[PDB]
Design a protein around this ligand. Structure first.
Ligand SMILES: *[B-](O)(O)[C@@H](C)NC(=O)c1c(F)cccc1F
Ligand SMILES: *[B-](O)(O)[C@@H](C)NC(=O)c1c(F)cccc1F
Ligand SMILES: [Cl-]
Ligand SMILES: [Cl-]
Ligand SMILES: [Cl-]
Ligand SMILES: [Cl-]
Ligand SMILES: [Cl-]
Ligand SMILES: [Cl-]
Ligand SMILES: [Cl-]
Ligand SMILES: [Cl-]
Ligand SMILES: [Cl-]
Ligand SMILES: [Cl-]
Ligand SMILES: [Cl-]
Ligand SMILES: [Cl-]
Ligand SMILES: [Cl-]
Ligand SMILES: [Cl-]
Ligand SMILES: [Cl-]
Ligand SMILES: [Cl-]
Ligand SMILES: [Cl-]
Ligand SMILES: [Cl-]
Ligand SMILES: [Cl-]
Ligand SMILES: [Cl-]
Ligand SMILES: [Cl-]
Ligand SMILES: [Cl-]
Ligand SMILES: [Cl-]
Ligand SMILES: [Cl-]
Ligand SMILES: [Cl-]
Ligand SMILES: [Cl-]
Ligand SMILES: [Cl-]
Ligand code: NA
Ligand code: NA
Lengths: 471, 471
């Protein structure tokens, strides 16, 4: 008899009608397929043959059914159970008057990539689609820390207080870049761009990456994302990207773990009855962002939750368990164009928890499904996890790496004090200031005219005009 | 033996070391004083004599100590107990790193004025000051629905979508009218003024009341407020006003009960051992605001909580008890100038709950004490009350009175479409629109130049300029 086990050896089942069974069985069959094909000396060339693939997939399945294999998962029994009870008890809180709302969640150890528990859906018995591991949806604005701002910072093209343009602007086709029914405002710090999840600042950031020839694909692929076309305007808003929750959880794991990626996994070992190791997870850690970059981003995402602008999460959690709400949470929300998908990604230094909600047919959620319902659900979910394993979230704080450089910049320009040229009259540029965190060697540049990320000639006119009137 | 009883006859004590005992004993002694002086045929003239007052106060005290009087309070035993356990368990949630934070609360039946339970402080054993009944503090922005907007509406001087100026302006002494460290913005609806609790719009509103000779003192005194000087610029921000929580609770009771005041009371009856009724609460209901006015205000204060701008309350409550959070809550927050006092006033159609926090020495709280800590505490408190008396909050909805008049106005001007004069060029005034609720007979006026409440000639220039550019 083959058994699937929790991470401490306790048996999950013999080879039973929920997500856990089918998800861990599927992954194991995949690992068995690879072992068996290698064992039988099947070249990767012969492995291309579709009749051969089919035979080896069935072999792997039967090999488990019949054999005496021990399959060690990463799953934590108390944690995963709590997470199931949570979704059964509180999942109704997702329903926002747009029909039954589906959900997927993945809880991941930041230092290993191991998956400690997950939520595949509202109720396997009614809908078997696995929303943690199978369904792919746009990650929307949760793309921005990874693909736009994180890389800009890591490339030394901006720092924690750099200014960006949220002035009105169009896609190449001439259409307005929208954020909800807003069409934009004026300049703003990275903090505000992130806390509000504005779109124009993300657009301009990714334009600057393109203009500088930055290898964005390299960052993304190091974390296991497959994106077919990087040449998309709305890429940093999640356009052209579809991800599972497990995959996307792994990106935020990278940020949380000070820039070091660990590949997600639910299977840790497969052994034959006699001990022969058939499969074993091999950890391959990769420094995707510099320690400076990640710790600076950690500090921005702390205020994304604190500010409470796009999510009620900290309020919800404070009420349920104020001691847990005092742990060091950082996070980012996301919303697709027709309120089709909502994400909330949460981390402590120890764990990351990814969450998505939506409909299987892709129809719209209510305007507040992400801001409110999913934040509240996730608060309950995080509470449930803590009560099942009191120390699992940890009490450690995120902190800036020593390698972080700190420059005093002007609040107004996000840049160092200096002279600068505004039609005629070149200005001494005074005003109040702040400490900006950079991930390069020199830190903030001297102030120059085109001070923001992005913006039109009109834009800089209005801005400097408003700025100078303030001297 | 004299007894003090809960509202169902259950005995509280014989004439024991908490707020309940001392508060109900004090009020009873006051009612005994009046009975005894009348009994002894002591004229109100002789009652002016201070030696005579002193004797009759001691007589009333001893008369209770010795006699066989039955004192019936309004207090609900389960409710009041739950409220004590709540403050003992969750009161620490008020502490915001500015020292120990004090608290007072009063729960009132909207249809009777009866006080069902209250919180006098963190812990009688450590500090005996009664913060529900004795301490008087400025009610700050919770003054605005009562004294500025409510009366403007009731006088037919504005409606639910009327525009007001939050443009920069000074007090007569030349100082900027501040809202936090902001000095103001542009025009805005009553909704936004209330949701954000901006100051300038309240200033201009109370100026308009003064300009029109409105009897403001008449509204306020009908609800039992004593305000010595109505000639104060910041009156609608709570300047020149100090109130107990019980008194201020009674004002919001008036709004909640569709404009009908019922005098607050904690004693309902005092009887001698033989049955002689010595004192009995006589209900004297008063229509302070029209039904139109109150129901229109109810609808504004629903969105003050919904919007979550000045209080996390609905988020906190949603997590603790989502079914209770679906009841029909309306409310208003307040903050004094140096973050010295925070208030949250909450109502369902059935109950009102007033809350204050602060320090006995008047020193500053943290910036977020009101927005966050007190909202969370109050959420727990409201939950505790529901669990002790499951139906007490009720499931009824606030609704507009039939007498409410409804006019289509321009979103931009808060006023009806028409022609109007802007230097030269008198405009046909187009644009998108909304339904505005008024409490007069004719509803919204035709649009005119000075369309807002308040504003300078500069102000209207910028506004109309921005408005016209939008046609
Ligand atoms: B992001 O998911 O916060 C960002 C791309 N989302 C939006 O722009 C957005 C909203 F803010 C609101 C509704 C839909 C939508 F795509
Ligand atoms: B009101 O209490 O909301 C209003 C009068 N309060 C304030 O203007 C205010 C703040 F908004 C913030 C800090 C102090 C203060 F008086
Ligand atoms: Cl499961
Ligand atoms: Cl599955
Ligand atoms: Cl075989
Ligand atoms: Cl386990
Ligand atoms: Cl690329
Ligand atoms: Cl992917
Ligand atoms: Cl490309
Ligand atoms: Cl795996
Ligand atoms: Cl074997
Ligand atoms: Cl590094
Ligand atoms: Cl917070
Ligand atoms: Cl569906
Ligand atoms: Cl450098
Ligand atoms: Cl008490
Ligand atoms: Cl007392
Ligand atoms: Cl006597
Ligand atoms: Cl009772
Ligand atoms: Cl008056
Ligand atoms: Cl008073
Ligand atoms: Cl006066
Ligand atoms: Cl009384
Ligand atoms: Cl008697
Ligand atoms: Cl009436
Ligand atoms: Cl709400
Ligand atoms: Cl909130
Ligand atoms: Cl004090
Ligand atoms: Cl009229
Ligand atoms: Na979002
Ligand atoms: Na306030």
């Amino acid at each position: 008899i083959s058994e699937i086990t929790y991470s401490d050896g306790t048996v999950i089942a013999s080879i039973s009608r929920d997500y856990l069974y089918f998800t861990t069985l599927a992954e194991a069959q995949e690992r068995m397929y690879d072992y068996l094909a290698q064992r039988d000396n099947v070249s990767a060339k012969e492995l291309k043959n579709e009749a051969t693939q089919k035979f080896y997939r069935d072999l792997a399945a039967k090999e488990i059914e019949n054999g005496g294999y021990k399959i060690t998962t990463t799953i934590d029994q108390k944690i995963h159970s709590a997470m199931q009870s949570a979704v059964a008890d509180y999942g109704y809180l997702l329903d926002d008057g747009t029909g039954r709302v589906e959900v997927g969640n993945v809880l991941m150890d930041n230092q290993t990539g191991a998956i400690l528990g997950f939520v595949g859906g509202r109720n396997y018995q009614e809908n078997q689609n696995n929303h943690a591991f199978d369904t792919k949806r746009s990650p929307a604005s949760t793309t921005k820390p990874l693909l736009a701002y994180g890389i800009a910072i890591d490339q030394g093209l901006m720092g924690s207080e750099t200014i960006l343009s949220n002035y009105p602007t169009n896609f190449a086709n001439g259409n307005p870049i929208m954020y909800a029914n807003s069409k934009g405002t004026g300049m703003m710090t990275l903090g505000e761009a992130l806390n509000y999840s504005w779109n124009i600042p993300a657009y301009w950031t990714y334009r600057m990456l393109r203009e500088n020839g930055v290898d964005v694909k390299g960052y993304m692929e190091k974390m296991g994302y497959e994106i077919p076309e990087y040449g998309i305007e709305s890429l940093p808003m999640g356009g052209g990207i579809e991800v599972t929750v497990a995959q996307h959880t792994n990106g935020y794991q990278t940020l949380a773990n000070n820039g070091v990626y660990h590949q997600k996994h639910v299977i840790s070992k497969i052994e034959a009855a006699d001990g022969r190791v058939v499969y074993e997870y091999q950890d391959k850690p990769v420094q995707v962002y510099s320690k400076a970059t990640a710790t600076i981003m950690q500090g921005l995402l702390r205020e994304v939750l604190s500010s409470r602008v796009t999510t009620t999460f900290k309020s919800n959690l404070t009420s349920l368990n104020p001691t847990l709400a005092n742990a060091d949470w950082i996070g980012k929300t996301g919303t697709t164009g027709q309120d089709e998908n909502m994400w909330l990604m949460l981390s402590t230094p120890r764990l990351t928890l990814g969450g998505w909600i939506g409909h299987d047919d892709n129809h719209s959620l209510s305007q507040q499904a992400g801001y409110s319902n999913n934040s509240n659900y996730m608060a309950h979910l995080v509470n449930a996890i803590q009560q099942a394993s009191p120390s699992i979230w940890g009490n450690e704080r995120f902190a800036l790496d020593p390698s972080v450089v700190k420059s005093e910049v002007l609040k107004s320009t996000g840049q160092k004090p200096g002279k600068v040229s505004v039609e005629g009259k070149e200005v001494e540029v005074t005003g109040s200031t702040v400490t900006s965190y950079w991930a390069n060697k020199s830190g903030a540049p001297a102030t120059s005219y085109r001070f923001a990320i992005g913006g039109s000639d009109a834009d800089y006119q209005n801005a400097w005009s408003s700025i100078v009137g303030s001297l």
